[PDB]
Every structure is written in structure tokens, then in C-alpha cells.
Design an enzyme around this catalytic site. Structure first.
Site, PDB file in Angstrom:
ATOM      1  CD  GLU A  69      -2.885  -1.424   2.234  1.00 35.74           C
ATOM      2  OE1 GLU A  69      -2.490  -1.458   3.424  1.00 35.74           O
ATOM      3  OE2 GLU A  69      -4.086  -1.522   1.912  1.00 35.74           O
ATOM      4  CD  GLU A 145      -3.553  -7.294   2.264  1.00 36.30           C
ATOM      5  OE1 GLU A 145      -2.429  -6.745   2.320  1.00 36.30           O
ATOM      6  OE2 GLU A 145      -4.600  -6.771   2.723  1.00 36.30           O
TER       7      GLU A 145
HETATM    8  C1  LIG Z   1      -9.862   0.143   6.110  1.00 38.29           C
HETATM    9  C2  LIG Z   1      -9.718   0.145   4.586  1.00 38.29           C
HETATM   10  C3  LIG Z   1     -10.109   1.521   4.044  1.00 38.29           C
HETATM   11  S1  LIG Z   1      -8.019  -0.222   4.024  1.00 38.29           S
HETATM   12  C4  LIG Z   1      -7.795  -1.962   4.473  1.00 38.29           C
HETATM   13  O1  LIG Z   1      -7.871  -2.112   5.925  1.00 38.29           O
HETATM   14  C5  LIG Z   1      -7.697  -3.500   6.340  1.00 38.29           C
HETATM   15  C6  LIG Z   1      -7.825  -3.589   7.871  1.00 38.29           C
HETATM   16  O2  LIG Z   1      -7.688  -4.944   8.293  1.00 38.29           O
HETATM   17  C7  LIG Z   1      -6.307  -4.038   5.893  1.00 38.29           C
HETATM   18  O3  LIG Z   1      -5.227  -3.314   6.512  1.00 38.29           O
HETATM   19  C8  LIG Z   1      -6.226  -3.915   4.364  1.00 38.29           C
HETATM   20  O4  LIG Z   1      -4.965  -4.369   3.905  1.00 38.29           O
HETATM   21  C9  LIG Z   1      -6.427  -2.449   3.971  1.00 38.29           C
HETATM   22  O5  LIG Z   1      -6.373  -2.318   2.545  1.00 38.29           O
END
Ligand SMILES: CC(C)S[C@@H]1O[C@H](CO)[C@H](O)[C@H](O)[C@H]1O
Ligand SMILES: CC(C)S[C@@H]1O[C@H](CO)[C@H](O)[C@H](O)[C@H]1O
Ligand SMILES: [Mg+2]
Ligand SMILES: [Mg+2]
Ligand code: NA
Ligand code: NA
EC number: 3.2.1.23
Lengths: 211, 210
Positions: A69, A145
Site C-alpha cells: 500500500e 489479500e
Molecule cells: C480500512 C480500509 C479503508 S483499508 C484496508 O484495511 C484492512 C484492515 O484490516 C487491511 O489493513 C487492508 O490491507 C487495507 O487495505
């Protein structure tokens, strides 16, 4: 990159590993503000190059990852090419910027659904079945993921596996994720309880999203 | 007097095993055609475009039979209604193709067409191409013609494109069948089918299977 023993155990017990550089700039606006900035290429480069120099001899590592990210910046293309040049024995992947950029050998989206498209501007998450056949696309797709297991979840898990088994180029994915990131706190009598975001006076926080 | 012996079965039948009624006879038109000794024996029309289809080149190859003469000419004129939009004239003698020369009995005309009206099922814009075989002085020997539709069909990056756009085929297979006349087609029935087809949102037809 993980504690060194992790790779030893994976080599010996037998698990495929995606080794990932310690690079995530999720909070930036836009997400690639730093990764597309040459001033940050040096810092990013060390997080990638030093990981490869440390773990390149581990058979369990089968795929290198440029991080997580951080959008898609020129720095990612540069580092993608660096790895391809120094270690051609392992594919390189990276999801930032749309999951199918020039910085990845594998279409590796996060939370792309099986049949439903999510046409987000600039970085759409196509149905994985549809993604494979977009004009000109030929790469394998493996979700970095998917099936976010937060609390009472994993509804629809079977839909992913039916698709994985039916489509040759759909080669699986990594569930998110293994273990709840809850921490132990104790009440007045010393009895432990599981705590999440905000339970340590930390604020702002994102509460239960760590589990 | 004409005598025609029609055989129901032939080695050709082995190649005509379509799923349909097996019939026989002279089921399509019969006609007599008179052509001059010096004639147009064949002609092909092609249309090429620039990147955004705002320009086009109509290329017409014409073949003749009969004695070759330096005075012979072919004029291909393109019309949009009663307005002539382009025209080209030339004597026979194609360009060199190999060590033995070229086709002395052929000629290719190339006409420029700016902002052509494009043909598609959506808007079937058509031009009329008239192929005139004549003497240099202007004496007409004979003329053939055809409707011309400016469109480019190509597969690029895995998509079938018409004039640069990806088609969505709303098609249907159609046999030539009539409950009373069998496999004999008439204009009335053909038109009836086409009207019904377009009225029901079909934009394509497959000539199953011939
Ligand atoms: C909260 C979303 C806008 S982003 C989302 O949050 C998740 C929380 O478990 C993970 O961190 C994912 O990788 C992330 O893309
Ligand atoms: C309702 C339309 C699809 S009919 C369509 O419209 C076109 C112009 O837009 C042309 O006039 C075509 O000849 C006509 O068939
Ligand atoms: Mg059949
Ligand atoms: Mg122009
Ligand atoms: Na598969
Ligand atoms: Na989380």
C-alpha cells in the site's frame, strides 16, 4: 522482512514464502506521493536491496514483494527492475497502484471479489475471473489479500475456491490474516483480557480493526 | 431450348449435410447476361482509413477481358446521392509485381475521400461506386456498379472492432426457409425477416450454413 528463524522453519517444514520489503506509505495523499519522488528512492532502495541480500538463499522464499500500500511510483519500477536483474530466479510482485502495474509479474489484488466488479476510479478491483481476460492481460492472478477474517467472517470463502479450481490462471491467494493483533491488559484483580485499539489511551485509533 | 438435368445426390452432397430439409431442383434465379467482347471481368473495392477515420482511400482493382488497347480506360466514380464525391480515371496496366512484369489486363484506381460517412448496422451509410470501361475519347463500353460502405473491420488486442469500436453481436442464425416454397427465397420474405430482426434488436445475422 521477518525474524530470520521464520525462513529457516519454512525451509524445513515446507511453506512457500512471499518475502516483502518493509515499505508502506498508506497514509500519504495520494498514496504514491513518496514512492514517485526520486528523493525517496535511496531510502526505499535499501529496504528492497538489503532484504534480497539477506534472504536470497532461502528456498522457501519463492516470490519477492516490493512492499505494501504505497500506490505506484517510478521508484517501484526502478526497484522492480533491480530485483529482476540481480535475482531472475524469483518472480516479483506488488499490488499498489491497481494490482496489475508494470511493477508486478503477478496480478495480485487485495479483496477483489469473485464475480462482482468494484469499478473504483483509477484503481478498479475487477472480478478476478474478469480480470484475467481483460484485453492484452496474460499474467497469473494470486490475491495478495482476500477473505478478510475480522470477527464473525469468511462468508463466501467457498466461492473463491470454486473459482480457483475452475480457472487455471486463478492460482489462489493469501487470506487476511493469520492472528488477531489483540494485546493483553489486566483488570483490578490481575485477570487478563484482550484489548484492541484505543484501550491504551491511544488516540486517534482504529479500534477492533487490528483483529 | 435449354435442357437441364438436375441430380438430387452427388459427391457434392457429402459436403452439404446441413441440419435442414434435404430438397433439390433449380431453386434460385436463372438469367441471361450479355457482356461486350471487351468487358469488365472482375472488380474489387477496398476502403482504408487514417487513425480516427476522418480520412479514407477507396481502392478499386478492375480486371478486363478482351484485346488490350492503349485507348482503353476505366473510370471509377463514387457517389453520395446525386452528388459525385470522387472520381479516378486510368489506362490499363498494373504496377510491376514480379520478374515477369505486372498485370497488363488490370488497373487499380485510388480515390481520396475526406470525412467519409461510415457504414455500420447502426447507420448504414452507403455510397455508390460506378465502374466505367470506356475509350479515352469517352465512348462507354459498359458499366458495372455496387453499393459501397466505408468501414474497417479488425481484431486488435483481442477485440473485434468496427470503425475502431468493439462490437457487441446481437445476432441470430438464419436459414433460407419458406413453409410453402421451401428453400426458394423472395424479396418480400427477406424484407419481412430483416424488419422483424431489427425491430427485435438484432444487429447481426449468420448465413447458416451456406
Ligand atoms: C480500512 C480500509 C479503508 S483499508 C484496508 O484495511 C484492512 C484492515 O484490516 C487491511 O489493513 C487492508 O490491507 C487495507 O487495505
Ligand atoms: C432508432 C435508430 C436506431 S434507426 C437508425 O437511425 C440512424 C440515425 O441515427 C440512421 O437514420 C439509420 O439509417 C436508422 O436505421
Ligand atoms: Mg449439423
Ligand atoms: Mg485530419
Ligand atoms: Na486455478
Ligand atoms: Na487490520
Amino acid at each position: 522482512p521477518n525474524h530470520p528463524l521464520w525462513y529457516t522453519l519454512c525451509d524445513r517444514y515446507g511453506l512457500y514464502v512471499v518475502d516483502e520489503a518493509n515499505i508502506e506509505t498508506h497514509g500519504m495523499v495520494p498514496m504514491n506521493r513518496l514512492t514517485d519522488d526520486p528523493r525517496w528512492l535511496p531510502a526505499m532502495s535499501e529496504r528492497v536491496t538489503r532484504m534480497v541480500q539477506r534472504d536470497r538463499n532461502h528456498p522457501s522464499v519463492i516470490i519477492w514483494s516490493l512492499g505494501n500500500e504505497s500506490g505506484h511510483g517510478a521508484n517501484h519500477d526502478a526497484l522492480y527492475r533491480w530485483i529482476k536483474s540481480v535475482d531472475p530466479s524469483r518472480p516479483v510482485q506488488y499490488e499498489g497502484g491497481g494490482a496489475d502495474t508494470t511493477a508486478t509479474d503477478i496480478i495480485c489484488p487485495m479483496y477483489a471479489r469473485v464475480d462482482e466488479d468494484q469499478p473504483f476510479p483509477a484503481v478498479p478491483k475487477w472480478s478476478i475471473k474478469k480480470w484475467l481476460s481483460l484485453p492484452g492481460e496474460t499474467r497469473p492472478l494470486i490475491l495478495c489479500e482476500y477473505a478478510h477474517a475480522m470477527g464473525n467472517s469468511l462468508g463466501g470463502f467457498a466461492k473463491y475456491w470454486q473459482a480457483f479450481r475452475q480457472y487455471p490462471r486463478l492460482q489462489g491467494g493469501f487470506v487476511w490474516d493469520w492472528v488477531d493483533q489483540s494485546l493483553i491488559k489486566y483488570d483490578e484483580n490481575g485477570n487478563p483480557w484482550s484489548a484492541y485499539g484505543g484501550d491504551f489511551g491511544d488516540t486517534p485509533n482504529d479500534a477492533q480493526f487490528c483483529m | 431450348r435449354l435442357a437441364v438435368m438436375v441430380l438430387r445426390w452427388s459427391d457434392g452432397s457429402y459436403l452439404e449435410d446441413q441440419d435442414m430439409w434435404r430438397m433439390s431442383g433449380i431453386f434460385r434465379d436463372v438469367s441471361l447476361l450479355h457482356k461486350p467482347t471487351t468487358q469488365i471481368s472482375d472488380f474489387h473495392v477496398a476502403t482504408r482509413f487514417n487513425d480516427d477515420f476522418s480520412r479514407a482511400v477507396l481502392e478499386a482493382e478492375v480486371q478486363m477481358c478482351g484485346e488490350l488497347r492503349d485507348y482503353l480506360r476505366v473510370t471509377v466514380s463514387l457517389w453520395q446521392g446525386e452528388t459525385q464525391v470522387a472520381s479516378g480515371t486510368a489506362p490499363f496496366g498494373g504496377e510491376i509485381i514480379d520478374e515477369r512484369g505486372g498485370y497488363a489486363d488490370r488497373v487499380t484506381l485510388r480515390l481520396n475521400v475526406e470525412n467519409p460517412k461510415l457504414w455500420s448496422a447502426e447507420i448504414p451509410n452507403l455510397y455508390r461506386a460506378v465502374v466505367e470501361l470506356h475509350t479515352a475519347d469517352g465512348t462507354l463500353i459498359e458499366a458495372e456498379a455496387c453499393d459501397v460502405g466505408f468501414r474497417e473491420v479488425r481484431i486488435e488486442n483481442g477485440l473485434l472492432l468496427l470503425n475502431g469500436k468493439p462490437l457487441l453481436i446481437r445476432g441470430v442464425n438464419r436459414h433460407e426457409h419458406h413453409p410453402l416454397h421451401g428453400q426458394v427465397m423472395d424479396e418480400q420474405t427477406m424484407v419481412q425477416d430483416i424488419l422483424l430482426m431489427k425491430q427485435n434488436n438484432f444487429n447481426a445475422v449468420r448465413c447458416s450454413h451456406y
